[PDB]
């Protein structure tokens, strides 16, 4: 049955959460390759700050390294270690423009 | 230390996962209101199918209802029950 207000708010306030990021989006210079898997599970700042004049952005960043299969058509494949940026702590901040 | 290939693949294959959806995106006709919270945690089909000719889409859908504060400036506020679409099972399909 129904999820109460206080639960929804707390679970949907700006915090780091497991997000599925496409590898291409992160490394766009690496186009020769086909990546398996094509995306990876990273912690990224999502959720809402409950104000149009504020955005949810990271403060504490870190790195995580994942074994990724990198296929290079008509050439060869291999398991390469690829590093990805993660978010450890998020905060609500003003939109700069 | 390093996450192995088989773990990354399995965790990043098309499956339903907790995604944070903006309420406006779901109900765009309701513009008079300001929603608190402005977004909600729903299960939606994410992840990759590992093929450019395929996309990850839902098969089994369901509904979940959440108490949301709906402010209507210079008028009044209230806790209204708002329904949202969820995904229970995903499958890889052609575009």
């Amino acid at each position, epitope marked *: 049955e129904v999820v109460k207000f206080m639960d929804v708010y707390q679970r949907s306030y700006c915090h780091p959460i497991e997000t599925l990021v496409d590898i291409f989006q992160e490394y766009p210079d690496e186009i020769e390759y086909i990546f398996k898997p094509s995306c990876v599970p990273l912690m990224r700042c999502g959720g809402c700050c*409950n104000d149009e004049g504020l955005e949810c952005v990271p403060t504490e960043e870190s790195n995580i390294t994942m074994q990724i299969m990198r296929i290079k058509p008509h050439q060869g494949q291999h398991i390469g270690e690829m590093s990805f940026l993660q978010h450890n702590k998020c905060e609500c901040r003003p939109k700069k423009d | 230390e390093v996450v192995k290939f088989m773990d990354v693949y399995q965790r990043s294959y098309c499956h339903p996962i907790e995604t944070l959806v903006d309420i406006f995106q779901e109900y765009p006709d309701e513009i008079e209101y300001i929603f608190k919270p402005s977004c909600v945690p729903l299960m939606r089909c994410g992840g990759c199918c590992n093929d450019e000719g395929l996309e990850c889409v839902p098969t089994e859908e369901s509904n979940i209802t959440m108490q949301i504060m709906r402010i209507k*400036p210079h*008028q*009044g506020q209230h806790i209204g029950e708002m329904s949202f679409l969820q995904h229970n099972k995903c499958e890889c399909r052609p575009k």
Partner: antibody
Amino acid sequence: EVQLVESGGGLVQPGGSLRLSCAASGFNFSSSSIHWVRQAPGKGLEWVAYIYPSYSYTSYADSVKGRFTISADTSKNTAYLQMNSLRAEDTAVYYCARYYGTGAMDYWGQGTLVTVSS
Amino acid sequence: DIQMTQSPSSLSASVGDRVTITCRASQSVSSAVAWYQQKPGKAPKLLIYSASSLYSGVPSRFSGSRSGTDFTLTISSLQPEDFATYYCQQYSYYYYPFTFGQGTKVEIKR
């Protein structure tokens, strides 16, 4: 010209009932909402209860919940606070105030004095 | 419950002096705070809302400001008719719709 007017406060025996009336003028009381706020002698301001007639939504403060009842006659352009089972602590000055952007109160009533004593 | 804690409790200043009333929130309220002015024997009058914006018809000397939890009403040129009790008020729905502080009785020095 906007104004809120309250009435019906006075002396009541503990455990007694007492009904407060907040009479709106100069705005569509249908298309807006009202707070009740009370202020005990010397002490500061405390939220009692709230109503938003358009969506028949109503909410009360814990210390009051179950004992008071907010209503509103949209026809009469009037809000009511029905107070049952009054205690010594319920002695206060009762203000109704109409609701401003995203919270806050812009227009307040003159305020009626409810005094619970035997 | 969200606790709004006003400082000081009472306060006297001279005519024309700068007066600073602070109001400290327990947990983040956002910019959802209002300041009121209650004369003796009358109802509160709204001065500031959304922490910083001035209500229509309030003289300019009254000015609200913020520091991520510490909210601050500032009367820039105190005047004898500013003698009053000043209340901060937080909203942002959490459990209650809003909450007040204990007040700040201002006085005039002459």
